[PDB]
Amino acid sequence: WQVLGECYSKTGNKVEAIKCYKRSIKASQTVDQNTSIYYRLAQLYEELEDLQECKKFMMKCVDVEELLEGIVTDETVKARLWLAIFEIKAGNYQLAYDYAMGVSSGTSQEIEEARMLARECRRHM
Amino acid sequence: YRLAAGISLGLINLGAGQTKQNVMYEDLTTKLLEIVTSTYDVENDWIPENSQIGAVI
Numbered sequence: 001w002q003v004l005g006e007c008y009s010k011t012g013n014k015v016e017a018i019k020c021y022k023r024s025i026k027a028s029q030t031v032d033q034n035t036s037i038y039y040r041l042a043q044l045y046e047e048l049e050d051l052q053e054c055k056k057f058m059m060k061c062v063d064v065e066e067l068l069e070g071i072v073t074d075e076t077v078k079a080r081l082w083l084a085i086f087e088i089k090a091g092n093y094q095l096a097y098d099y100a101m102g103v104s105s106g107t108s109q110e111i112e113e114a115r116m117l118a119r120e121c122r123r124h125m
Numbered sequence: 126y127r128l129a130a131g132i133s134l135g136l137i138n139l140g141a142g143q144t145k146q147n148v149m150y151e152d153l154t155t156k157l158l159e160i161v162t163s164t165y166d167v168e169n170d171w172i173p174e175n176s177q178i179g180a181v182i
Binding site for chain 1: 144147
């Protein structure tokens, strides 16, 4: 099912690719395997100009990390960086500060992106 | 070369001064002001007057 979603995504059929990934999520036996799908699924909603809808899926992918005693995986690193960036535009600096700190153990570019964001929100905190 | 360095520093951090990073911007600002306002009775080798325009720019 996940492969079918990629083909639809690559052919400009965003309306169908949304439904394809949701079916894949149910078939997965373990929640941890849904970490990769959630981030890509959130991106497709971002291409479907509705930023509010993709927030709920961004909550779930990030929350899986907490439910897995801090899995700290790569595809959640991009989730926290994107989530914190949007929270700055929402004016809630306090709710965005912890997101940067939690992702401070990723790649070289990941940590610096959150570190500068941490300084920005701390000043307005 | 110092004029090029001054314009370089100014262009990289364009629009970073409207702060009410702030600590580090304040440190950089006070360092540049120290460069532009320092008066030396004896010419120091590694801070000549050639960098004044770059600090000002």
